[PDB]
Write a protein that binds this ligand. Sequence first.
Ligand code: BZX
Ligand code: BZX
Ligand code: BZX
Lengths: 141, 142
Amino acid sequence: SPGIWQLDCTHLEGKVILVAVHVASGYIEAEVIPAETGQETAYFLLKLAGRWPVKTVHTDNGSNFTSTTVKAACDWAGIKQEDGIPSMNKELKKIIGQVRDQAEHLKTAVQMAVFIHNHKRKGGIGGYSAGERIVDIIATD
Amino acid sequence: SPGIWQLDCTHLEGKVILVAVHVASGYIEAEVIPAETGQETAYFLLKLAGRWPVKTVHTDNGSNFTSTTVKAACDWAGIKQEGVIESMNKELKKIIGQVRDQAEHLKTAVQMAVFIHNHKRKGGIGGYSAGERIVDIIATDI
Ligand SMILES: Oc1ccc2c(c1)OCO2
Ligand SMILES: Oc1ccc2c(c1)OCO2
Ligand SMILES: Oc1ccc2c(c1)OCO2
C-alpha cells in the first residue's frame, strides 16, 4: 500500500500533464510533458522513484507504457509495473483554474496547483494534508 | 530545521544542474536546465515547495535569485531566501560520472544519480538512507 502510485494523464490547452498519485495519501506529483512518448514517460518515472520509495505503479496501459524504454526504466528502478489495473484529474483542473490568471505559462500553473493540492487540509480544521499523510505513511523511523 | 534547503548549480557539458539539498538529511532534488535563468530558478523553487515543506532556501549570490520572477514565486510559496552539504554535492557529481556512460543524455544520468544518492543506506546494519532521513525528520516535526 505505501509503495503504490497511480499514474494518469490529463490534456489541457493542447499540452500533456502526467500525474502520479500516491494512492494511500492523495499526494501528487505532476509535470507538463511535450507528448506521451516512451522516453518522456520513463524519465518521469525515474524522477519519481528517485524522490519517493516507489514499489508499484498502476498505469492506464497507454502505448507509452508498453514501450520497452519504460519497462527498462521500471526494471532499473525496481518498480513493479501494473498496466490496466484500476478523480484527481478533475480536482486538479479545478485548482489549475484558480491560479491560471497568475501564471503566464501552463507549466507554472500546474506546479502551483500541485502545491495547493498537497498543502490542503482535508476533513475539517482537525484534519491533515496529503503532504502530511504521505510522510506519516512512508516514515520508517 | 526540517524546512531548510541549500540550492546550488553545477556546470557540466555546457548544461546547468540545479541541486537542492535538504540540509538536515542530505536528501537531494536536482534538475538539468538549458541555462541558469530567473524563470528556470523560479520554476525549480515552485516545484520543490509543492513537494516538500520548504521554509528557507540558502543560495549563492546569483542574479537569478533576486529576479522579480523568483521573488514572486518565493512570496507565493512562502519561501524565505538567504559545511557537509558541500559534500553531498561532490558526492553527486562523483555518482554522475560513475553512471554517465550508462545513459544517453546527461539528464538521465543526473536523475539516476539522484536515485542512487537518495536510496543509498549510510553506515552499517542500523543505517538510513537520505530519503528515509528526510521523511523521518518531517514526520517527527508533524
Ligand atoms: O511531507 C510534506 C509535508 C507538507 C507538504 C508536502 C510534503 O508537500 C507539500 O506540503
Ligand atoms: O509548506 C509548508 C508546510 C508545512 C510547514 C512549513 C511549510 O513550514 C513549517 O511547516
Ligand atoms: O524511504 C524513502 C523515502 C524517500 C526516498 C527514498 C526512500 O528513496 C528516494 O527518496
